């Protein structure tokens, strides 16, 4: 993964994206990265 994803915070899902450098993708209880 890149790090964890939690559907709680509105800016959670911005958190996720911003692990991957700015372009993550969440996928339930994982955030992953486009890599």
Do not use: E, H, S
Not at 11 to 35: E, I, S, V, Y
């Amino acid at each position: 993964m890149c790090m964890p994803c939690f559907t709680t915070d509105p800016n959670m899902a911005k958190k996720c994206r911003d692990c991957c450098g700015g372009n993550g993708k969440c996928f339930g209880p994982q955030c992953l990265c486009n890599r």
